[PDB]
Amino acid sequence: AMLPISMSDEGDSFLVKDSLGENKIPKNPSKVVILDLGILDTFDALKLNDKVVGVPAKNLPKYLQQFKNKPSVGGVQQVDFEAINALKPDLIIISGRQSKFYDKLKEIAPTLFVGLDNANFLSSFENNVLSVAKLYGLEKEALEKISDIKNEIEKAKSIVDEDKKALIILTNSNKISAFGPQSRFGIIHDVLGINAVDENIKVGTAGKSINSEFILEKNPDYIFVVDRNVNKERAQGILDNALVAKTKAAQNKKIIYLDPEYWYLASGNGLESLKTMILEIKNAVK
């Protein structure tokens, strides 16, 4: 299990420990640079927009356009360190995609990691939300919102068919990769309890390289597609063949194209963006 964030209250600051290291973080930080999209959504949800001074305003998705005029500190993959320094922030918040930049960010300002543990997604989301809330004294508000998401999960689980199985795939122009439980797409299996056609896909970010023959072999009842092409080529075209057509998922129009701006960008730290993803699965399978 990923080490959670722990915090001790030291008057006008917190001593904070997470999996990447220790930071003294001021109470009520007023100049926050956020590189994790999900936790930026959580700042919205907690009414903290005015604390934010920098975002990755290159890739910003549709649901985060209230931040489109904030100073940009980069994109989905690149970080602009000159920019972050010029903002003179009091806190930087990052998740897994940015752990590679930890030491250089921490030379600028305290750097808080809000990682999502693929083996323990809900506990890490809750810990990430509540920890940001504690910086601002908003535990009450955050616990209410976390309750709302737990309720949503229970409504979603309650309609899942125990006998049906799903496959998760990531598509490229000319390649399909499969993902399973405890992957970065895993909440479909792990949180919502939809069974997988293959619970033994090996752990790792590249997933398992597959073909349409594999898909027909597994004969999923649902196929969840995350289309990285979102190129001319789309997942609909990769899957437009007589092997896939034969599957229960094809025949029942349960090939589901999930919005990559949520799944691929892994916005699970968002109080609203997680909800959106929960409902997107629910609605696909009810």
Side-chain angles (χ1 to χ4, degrees), residues 235-237 239-245 247 249-250 252 254-282:
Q236 286 86 347
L239 300 173
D240 185 13
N241 66 60
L243 301 170
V244 172
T247 63
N252 300 136
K254 303 292 197 180
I255 301 183
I256 309 300
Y257 297 93
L258 290 176
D259 182 346
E261 293 195 339
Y262 288 86
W263 291 91
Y264 194 91
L265 295 192
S267 344
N269 279 324
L271 288 164
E272 193 69 23
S273 50
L274 180 53
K275 184 177 162 170
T276 301
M277 277 195 274
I278 299 162
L279 294 166
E280 187 176 15
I281 298 313
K282 188 188 178 191

Side-chain angles (χ1 to χ4, degrees), residues 36-38 61 63 116 118 121 156 168-170 179-180 183-194 205 224-228 256-269 272-285:
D36 179 62
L37 299 172
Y63 58 91
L116 288 167
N118 292 337
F121 176 86
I168 304 167
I169 63 176
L170 180 71
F179 286 86
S183 65
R184 66 180 193 277
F185 310 112
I187 69 179
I188 294 168
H189 294 132
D190 313 317
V191 174
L192 298 180
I194 298 162
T205 64
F224 290 107
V225 183
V226 177
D227 192 357
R228 207 176 148 250
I256 309 300
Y257 297 93
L258 290 176
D259 182 346
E261 293 195 339
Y262 288 86
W263 291 91
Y264 194 91
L265 295 192
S267 344
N269 279 324
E272 193 69 23
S273 50
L274 180 53
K275 184 177 162 170
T276 301
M277 277 195 274
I278 299 162
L279 294 166
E280 187 176 15
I281 298 313
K282 188 188 178 191
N283 290 324
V285 309

Side-chain angles (χ1 to χ4, degrees), residues 120-137:
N120 296 280
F121 176 86
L122 283 175
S123 51
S124 62
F125 163 79
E126 293 177 59
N127 180 55
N128 291 343
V129 175
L130 280 184
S131 296
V132 161
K134 281 193 269 178
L135 296 177
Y136 295 99

